[PDB]
Each structure stands twice: as C-alpha cells, then as structure tokens.
Design a protein around this ligand. Structure first.
Ligand code: BSO
Ligand code: BSO
Ligand code: BSO
Ligand code: BSO
Lengths: 123, 123, 123, 123
C-alpha cells in the first residue's frame, strides 16, 4: 500500500532508515543510519521507536513520530511527520526533527536543542 | 533514584504524564493527559512511546524522547529532553516538542509543525 | 558580490523577496511576497527588516536574519540563515523560520509558533 | 502604554535588552546583553533590529520579531513573540527564538540552528 511506513527510506542528507511493520496500536520500531553527525565519533546504526496515527478516510496519510536512540552519541533525536504520495505514486515522508544534546547543567539547557527538516523517499 | 523517568510528572501548562519503567533497551511507554488542545475536541488520555539513553558516569542525566499518539486529534507530538536535579533534589524534565498536524496536501506541509518547550516536575 | 544579499530571491514554495542594499551596520530592509498563507486572506507584499554579520575572512558567508511584518495577517515571521555558493557559483540562502500567531490570551502562547525551513535562489 | 515594547526588559536567563521607540512603520532598534553564550568569547552588547504589527482593536497586543547581530560571535539570533499584560498589569514578552551558527559548508546546514523560548519582564 502507498505510504505504508514499513520498509526502507532515504533522506536528502543521505541518511537511511528502516521501519518495521506497525503493531496493532500503531507502534513501530526501526533502525536509522544517519549520513551525518555533529559529533566526531564514527556513526553506528541506531534503533528507533515510534507510533503512527490510524489512517483517516479522506485520502490523507496519518501523522507519525519516532525517537532515535543514537548508538554513538549521548544525544537523542525525535522526528515527526506525514507521508505524501504524488501523481506518479512516489512516496515522500515530510519530517521535522529536534536533536537534543546532553548538557552538563540545567543552566545550559537553553542551548541543547537543534531543529531541522528532512524529506525521505522510498529506497 | 533521582531523575528516574518512571512515575508521574506535571508541566507548567497543567498537563500530566505517567512514564512506565524502562525496558532493558531503555524503551518506555506511558500516558499523557494534556491540559490544552489546539483542537475543539474533548481531551482524552493518550499513549506515549519513547526511549532514553543509558546514564553516563559524570553526574548528568541522559537524554530521552517520546512520541504522543493523541487519542482525540489527528496530530502527533514528539518531545525530547533531559532531567535535572537541583540542590534540594527537586527533579525537572526540560523538554522541547514538535506538534505535527495532518494536512490535506503536500503543499500545506510548510504550516504543519508547531514548536515549544515545557518543564515537568515530579507530582 | 557572490552571496550578496541585496537583490531578488525566490524559495521552493514560490515566494519572492527583495532585499535592499545593506547599510554600513549590516542592517537592511526589503519586501516579501509569500506564495502561501495559513490565513484565508489575500496575500499582500510585506516589508522586512533585518541584519547581517560582517563577512569573515575564511571564505564563509556571514549569518543574517530578518523579520517580516505581514500586511494581510496578524502574525509575524522571523527568518535566519546563511548564503552558500556552489561549485558553479550558484547562490542559495539556507534559512529557518518561525511564524508567530497573535493569540487571544497568554495561556494560548504554547500553540502560537510554527517552525520550518526554506531555501532561496537568486532570481 | 501597557505592553509598549519601548523600554528595558530582562528574561529568565538573566539577559537584558533595550528596545528603542518604534518608528511610524512599527520598525525598531535596540541593544541586547545576553547572560549566556554557546561560545567561549566574552559577551558584548549587541544591536537588534525588528518590527511590530500595528495594534488591533480587540485588546490583544500585536506580534513582533527582531534580529540580534552578536558582536562577539559569528551567529545570528531571531526572536519572535507577543506581549501580555496579566491581571495585575505586569507585562511579559513570550518569545521563541532561533540561533543560527555560521557553518563551514552547505552540507553542514542541517546542524546550524538551535531553537528555544524566553519570557521577558519589564525592568
Ligand atoms: O550527531 C548527533 O548528535 C547524532 C546524529 C544526529 C543526526 C541528525 C541528522 N541526520 C539526519 O538524517 N537528519 C538530521 C537530524 S538527526 O538528529
Ligand atoms: O491539540 C492537539 O493537536 C493535540 C494536543 C496537543 C497538546 C500540546 C501541548 N500540551 C502540552 O502539555 N504541551 C504542549 C505540546 S503538545 O503537542
Ligand atoms: O499566513 C500567515 O500568517 C502569514 C504568511 C506566512 C507565510 C509563511 C511561508 N511562506 C514562505 O515563504 N515561507 C513560509 C514561512 S512564512 O512564515
Ligand atoms: O552564543 C552565541 O552564539 C550568541 C549568543 C546567543 C545567546 C542566546 C541565549 N540568550 C538569550 O537571552 N536567549 C538565548 C537565545 S540567544 O540566541
């Protein structure tokens, strides 16, 4: 089915992710291979956990989000988004994300969160 | 233990959330009772799914995130953050969030995502 | 003059903007013709006001930001970004933005702010 | 003059800012003394430039935004917000911000932008 989250996706940065089938409650797992890191550590495949809303009846794909638990950094990213299918059946996940760094003190919390967007296409 | 995610939390908006114990992989579930909605629907307790990094050894709490699958809206929120413990042992979760609305077309994606911050204290 | 902000730009949504010459302090003015709106109002050209950092000497273009005072809406947008010149000399402004709605009370501030990204190319 | 931007403000991080009188077009200037920095540089007073919407007639203060050109860093911040007067007449600016780092290449743009919120009270 078009825009099913399950499967292999790639974003404009060259990152890849695999999403599992959805459980009955719309929960899913997956793995994320980022192309880029703000750290200087070697990148390792990392697990993700999320949930997607059940589909409506208006020809629109439901919203979803997940958390990436990076295996090589102390940071955590969450992504939230919605899939779209164009005229030609090409699927795209439009996503926004927040990347949270682990900071030394509460006084540094103001600087801890970066934000961005990604677009994923089906591999 | 201080800053253990498991338990009952409340934010400045008056929202409440319960977080489960962490599984071995640092995955957790929970429920979220928001005080506020951008919709005009009646608020219903909603499930959450997330993951937390394992703790370091520097006296700092690890980062974490989760997804809220709202039971009364087509939207999805993700939250990402870090707990802090003050001089007096009062715990606070410092969080940033993105709220994603389900939009009718890809051309409306630009307007689909709101952003904010919350601070949770232990109930 | 590569990556000189002064001039005419268009982003991926079809929005156009004109930036005036920078004054000595790096402040500038301009106009912004958005292709899209979250309102049901007729879009009208709107003024912008901003500032850019002095160029450094390392071959990297300086960061800059601006505010757009929409003439057809009660909201305000801020854009912040940096210009890049590709291998062929083509200029792109990579920007992130926040769109702030005017809300009826303080309790409503939580839902007031949308976030996104745009890329502009020279017209 | 309740919620008149002109004047002196301090936020929860200890930052101070002075906003000049608004000109007829609602544009303004000012200075910003941040208490905190993501750099290891000595903080220096920095100029801001912004704009505010014309007051409506519904008893709600208009949205506004500004850019801060940090004098001690290569980054730029944009703030966007709205003033509120509480039951006792106390004014608070509820603001969200983006802090854009200058990055060495375009490929690095993804990590360039931090986001957060501040609340200002009249000094
Ligand atoms: O560097 C880190 O702290 C962990 C790796 C973060 C990779 C980021 C980057 N990769 C990607 O595919 N989209 C952006 C948003 S994700 O936080
Ligand atoms: O209105 C909706 O679309 C679903 C409910 C969203 C509640 C928001 C609001 N509640 C809260 O505790 N923090 C903020 C961020 S959450 O998206
Ligand atoms: O609808 C409104 O409230 C005012 C118009 C906002 C247009 C938005 C939209 N147009 C554009 O070029 N980029 C995005 C970010 S801007 O806030
Ligand atoms: O360190 C830098 O790059 C420049 C200074 C940035 C200070 C930040 C910090 N100060 C403040 O009052 N609110 C937050 C958001 S502002 O970007």
């Amino acid at each position: 089915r078009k825009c099913e989250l399950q499967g292999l996706w790639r974003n404009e940065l060259g990152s890849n992710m695999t999403i599992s089938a959805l459980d009955v409650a719309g929960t899913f797992s997956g793995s994320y291979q980022t192309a880029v890191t703000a750290t200087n550590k070697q990148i390792l495949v990392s697990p993700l956990k999320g949930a997607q809303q059940p589909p409506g009846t208006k020809g629109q794909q439901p919203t979803f989000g997940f958390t990436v638990q990076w295996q090589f950094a102390d940071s955590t990213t969450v992504f939230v988004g919605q899939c779209f299918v164009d005229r030609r059946g090409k699927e795209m996940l439009e996503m926004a994300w927040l990347l949270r760094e682990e900071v030394p003190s509460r006084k540094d919390t103001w600087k801890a969160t970066r934000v961005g967007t990604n677009v994923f296409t089906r591999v």
